[PDB]
Design a protein around this ligand. Structure first.
Ligand SMILES: [Mg+2]
Ligand SMILES: [Mg+2]
Lengths: 64, 96
RNA sequence: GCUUCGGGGAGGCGGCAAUAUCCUGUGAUCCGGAGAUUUCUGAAUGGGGAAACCCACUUACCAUAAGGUAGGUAUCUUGAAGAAGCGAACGAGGGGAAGUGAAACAUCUCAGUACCCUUAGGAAAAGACAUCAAAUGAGAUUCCCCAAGUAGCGGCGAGCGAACGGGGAGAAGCCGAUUAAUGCUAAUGUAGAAGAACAGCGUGGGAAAGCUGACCGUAGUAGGUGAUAGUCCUGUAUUCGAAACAUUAGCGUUAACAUAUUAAGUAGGGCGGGACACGAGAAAUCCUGUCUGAAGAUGGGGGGACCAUCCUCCAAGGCUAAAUACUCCUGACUGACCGAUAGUGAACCAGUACCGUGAGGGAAAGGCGAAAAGAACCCCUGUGAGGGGAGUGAAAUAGAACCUGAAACCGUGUGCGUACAAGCAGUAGGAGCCUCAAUUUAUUGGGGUGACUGCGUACCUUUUGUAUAAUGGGUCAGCGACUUAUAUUCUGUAGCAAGGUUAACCGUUUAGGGGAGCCGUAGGGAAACCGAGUCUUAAUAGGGCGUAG
RNA sequence: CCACUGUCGUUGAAAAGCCAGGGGAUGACUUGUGGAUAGGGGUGAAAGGCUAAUCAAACUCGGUGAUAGCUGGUUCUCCCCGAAAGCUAUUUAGGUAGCGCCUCGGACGAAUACCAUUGGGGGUAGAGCACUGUUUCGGCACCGAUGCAAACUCCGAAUACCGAUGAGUAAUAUCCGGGAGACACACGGCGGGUGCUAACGUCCGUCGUGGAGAGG
RNA sequence: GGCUCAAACUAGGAGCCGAAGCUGCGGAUUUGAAACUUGUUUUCAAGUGGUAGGGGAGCGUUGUGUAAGCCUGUGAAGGUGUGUCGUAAGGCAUGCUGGAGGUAUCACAAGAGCGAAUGCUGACGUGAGUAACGAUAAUGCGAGUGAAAAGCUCGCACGCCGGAAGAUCAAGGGUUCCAGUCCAACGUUAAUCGGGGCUGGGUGAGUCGACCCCUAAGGCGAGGCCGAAAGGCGUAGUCG
RNA sequence: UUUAUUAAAAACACAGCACUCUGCAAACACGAAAGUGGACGUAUAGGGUGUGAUGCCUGCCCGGUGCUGGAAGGUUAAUU
RNA sequence: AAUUCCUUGUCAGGUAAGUUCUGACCUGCACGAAUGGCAUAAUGAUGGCAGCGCUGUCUCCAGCAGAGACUCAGUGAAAUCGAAAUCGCAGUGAAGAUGCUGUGUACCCGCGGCUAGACGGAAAGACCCCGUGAACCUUUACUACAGCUUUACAUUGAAC
RNA sequence: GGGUUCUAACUCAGGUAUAACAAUACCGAGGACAAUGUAUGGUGGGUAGUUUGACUGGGGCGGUCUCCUCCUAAAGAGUAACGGAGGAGUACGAAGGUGCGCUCAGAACGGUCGGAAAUCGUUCAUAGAGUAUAAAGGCAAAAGCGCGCUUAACUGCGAGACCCACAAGUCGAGCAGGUACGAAAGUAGGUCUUAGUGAUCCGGUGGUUCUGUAUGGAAGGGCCAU
């Protein structure tokens, strides 16, 4: 049977929450000496996917 | 899908995170309000399977406080939360 | 077309397509079984060759002349028997693209696909654990529904994509589950046979339709018959036949082949590749070109690097039905499939005409009427073509180019307008004329025409913007473009409702059964884990995310 | 056998010819018949020539319904609403995506708009030399007269924008969701840069019209 | 056009014309509001230009059921006129033609609607009775036959070729060869003529050619070599 | 000789010249290989390249890139 | 100069007059010695320049012959084509008008000519640009591969 | 640890016999070489598959592409041009924190070398200076200049805003813990501010119980930091 395929790379970046999707933030992989400790604090942890982007996230991960 | 016109897409702007746990694939959470599908008074993983509350390949089960229990049950090999445990013994059952 | 064995019973000598001579109850034509004959080419097979031809050798017999009849003579394999070639799809195996996608492109995708090559069988392959599992363990292979677009793989891009297990179909394990004959017994098939019941009246060319009244029905929505038939014909329901041959089974028997005895150049390893969903990856497992190389039950293989423990199973011998794949074909039946530009390319003398050196490409083209009753005869004409009478027919502008007979296009006739007037040709007005009707009589109403006045630069497309001198269309007719399948989300509607719903399957089949699974009912967190909470934190603070299907 | 020149012919008598002239004409000659070399291959006294009227990779069939951000086309009717030609990004620039703008459904209910009164901040028009520069004349760099400036300001509006309060008027604003289209814009004003205060020029801002709007 | 104490200009005034604007009258429609309240009724208010595009309501067509119905030779479908009804798509009736089928209603399913795609097929226009009738070697007349004669036959004369435009072949074709008969089509006109139609006839070999014997180039090739397969090569030979 | 079908030439070829390769199972070329051509030839031969009768002639540069020879040293694969 | 841009260089010759030609100079943008240099008899349907002869090439066309064209009879195409009741001018206007404005002119219809316009026909511009189009060619672009070559192992051994 | 020799593998496109080809036998010549398979380094337009940007008053050429400052910019924000002008791709363990203290450029007068201008004294001097660096804005409570002690150039966060298509970016009181300086109230999460920058993937490193494919480990993965 033919089914919709998940974007397997989008599934690795997005996770289902109750009313949205959670995500990690960018700019934390490398180049971290020059960054202030406020930015190192506040770029750590989960954000929610933006309301303008959750349509694309739903199109990309249809089974989550 | 996932194409922004050439701008690097959102899912590739962002980092991958987490790992997938195999243990979570075989643990089933059971609500107090599903227990009306159980035949008898004993509540074990096998009994939940034959009630079809959990999938037949689930190894573990957890009973959580979602609805209410209408009769006294005997939960044998399942994990029971704090509120679920108090509600179970308020209805008159026991956990072992 | 010859013989025979069965069927059948009155016509017949295939079609276009008739005519003649004839055959036929001394049983024809026709149908079914069997046999006989069976030119030449083609595997083509005596040699050769531009297929349908040329040239032979040899044995036996007959002839006496320059031959005739019946044979034999290819190659390969196996020890006389086989093979060869052809032909649907499906199987197994040896080789194996690229366009494309990645919005470029090289890894990757396409795809082990197309194609080429080899070779089977009614199926093939696989198959009995050196298999999984980690549960109270299960117990070969194949196929279907789930698991699941999950776990993974992946320039972690585009994509690719399991398994465990659950529910089904089918079940089987052996060491001869082989092949080919023959002979019985049974059944089938290949021709056939019987097979109910309607009349009157009116209309009509014709009755099956109308009106009236009957009948049959284990037979009433069949195809025909001059219009629509249960009772007119062929049929249908039902009951049924086989001398001969085939096929399927069961049995018996024969003759061919096969019949391991537990597995070493093997398992494992180095190097290079390949296959595993898995692209070298931390990469198990399988396969092997190259180089090596055990233990052998006090042993060995696997459990996804690897080690220990535990479980499990014994490779290096062979086999094995079903459930699964397919359709060149045969039979029966079916269709919210087509109806002549459709449906096969092909309803028709089509893989034809035609085109091409060739491989190959590849059409157009159906219909009188119920019955030819297909128009004797006469007339014009050239014994032509064509027509007009006569005749036939219900009908002949149904007359053979024949049902109906649209449009483009081209005539003839009638009415009105039009030869001093400038353009998308109409429109709004409007005189006159012509013609039908009324009307107690030139007035209205309908129709045709349109002098004269006003206004007025086609349509489509594409554009900032088109009369545009931008695009497209000579015209007509016919055909020609948002589908289908699955997944998914939202909306409506219906049923059930904290529940809803089954899938494959089974089913004497839209039912009933089948609960495997899926969605909902809880979230938080990477996760373990906890749970109306949870995460972060030293924090019980703060903060994040949470608190009718 | 060839093909140098010209006329003709060019829907030809002909998909390469005719006519009149021209060259080789015992040679590296011409010609018959049969054969050989095959597609990234052949063959080539070399022009990328020729390989069946096909050649910078033949033809046929197949992969194949190649792909085509491009062009064309897209068939009945009526009712309601109704854009955009912008910003951001883009191997992007005539494509696409988020946002803006359109529509439909739901939620919400004055939170919206207009005006009056009122609380704000500003550095523009104007203006001016207090700074930075620049300019002229006089007196003796400074004094006094006198000009000018996008990147000068001692000053400084109107408007506009952000608030408050209050009437009336009004088919408001906002949020969540289904479906878009659009991201070539043009002109006339106004304020400018650019150009020549040239352009039916170009680039912004801002209004109106056209786009998608007939009528006078 | 034409205009001069304007029909120009300036400053004033009064009349009038002038749009699909506004008003009047009739009708329809969207939304909202009020009440017999799913059009059951009346009103009222605000609306009703529109491309891309979104939303809403319908028409027709083929087919299935409803339908063993209903209609239909006292005339179905289709064709072609007319009348009539609806906002439209369109419906209804009916004359003529036609001669055997059609289909109400409500559901249901679409090969469901065409003017454009230098769209596809067929038919038929315009150009236009226009260009042309294919070597400028050439014809004239008399007879004959015939429906008909420039073109056929016969005759006389004329002209052209004559290293061909005559003759014999090979190749290729395949009956075109000869006679009779016919003239629709074919022949670039007509045709009595023909390489056209139809019917008959015609090809005679020891010596000519083929076959045959022989070999060239070049093929094929018991065995043989080589190659994943397919195949490639090659000896003896065997063809050519 | 050539662009069959818009170019016939100054283009190609040519006899002649030079360089260079090749000792024969030649180099070289076709081919997967077998088998071939070179050639039943043998350095006065055969291949490749340039130049192009003939006359007079053909200067300088070995840094670059090739080619030929050399190998002291540096670096360097699989393997181990 | 088959090479020279400036450039028709300069000077000489030829002509009445010569951007070409011939000779020479050297200031060679940017000749040069086997991608040969400079010459060269003969040869060439080769390039340039100059003469004689000859001429309808021309001044400047005339006459004549044949074949068409034209008329009649027979046969009977073509491309094109939204539809046409299809005039000029000056304006206008998607910016060059038969079709719009104003105006001027014009009775209806052929035939022989003709080509100024219908941005005439013909060919989805080859120029130019664009497309994350194609092809083929090049190379010290990238990445591969054939081929050629190196070494290890195997085929592969013995003695000193 | 290299040569030399041998022959028996292997080779012969040598001779003789086997009809011919080939093979075979013998002889002869070579010979552990050659040659071939696997692996490997080099060479390799001989051959393939492809790439070779965009903006742009047509394209090419040139220039540019990200960030900061001023203007254009129409007195809120924003706002284009291949418009006009300039900077950045750093620096600093002090040039950061704090407590305390200070005030600059110039001009004139006096004074040894000594001047136009060195250092010293005086008088005016709101900044005509400085601010690591461009410009703008700012700066006396100095943000400018010294000195002592120091590590707040902290860890966990953060109400609330600004900006914004997203991804990002910016400001931030307050709370907890630890700290520095101050007698203290306090101030301090870098530097007057606005440039000094680069997503994801992949890989490395320091930590961590989170996971760990029968089980215990481990490998690998995750989380935090880089
Ligand atoms: Mg008819
Ligand atoms: Mg050709």
């Amino acid at each position: 049977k033919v089914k919709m395929k998940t974007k397997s790379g989008a599934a690795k970046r997005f996770k289902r929450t109750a009313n949205g999707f959670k995500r990690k933030q960018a700019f934390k992989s490398h180049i971290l000496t020059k960054k202030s400790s406020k930015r190192i604090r506040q770029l750590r942890g989960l954000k929610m996917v933006d309301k303008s982007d959750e349509a694309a996230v739903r199109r990309m991960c249809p089974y989550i | 899908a996932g194409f922004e016109g050439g701008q690097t897409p959102l899912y590739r702007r962002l980092p991958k995170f987490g790992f997938t746990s195999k243990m979570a694939m075989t643990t089933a959470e059971v609500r107090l309000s599903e227990l009306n599908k159980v035949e008898g008074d004993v509540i074990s993983v096998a009994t939940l399977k034959t009630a079809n509350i959990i999938r037949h390949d689930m190894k573990r089960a957890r009973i959580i406080l979602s609805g209410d229990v209408t009769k006294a049950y005997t939960f044998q090999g399942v994990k029971v939360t704090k509120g679920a445990k108090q509600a179970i013994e308020a209805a008159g059952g026991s956990i072992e």
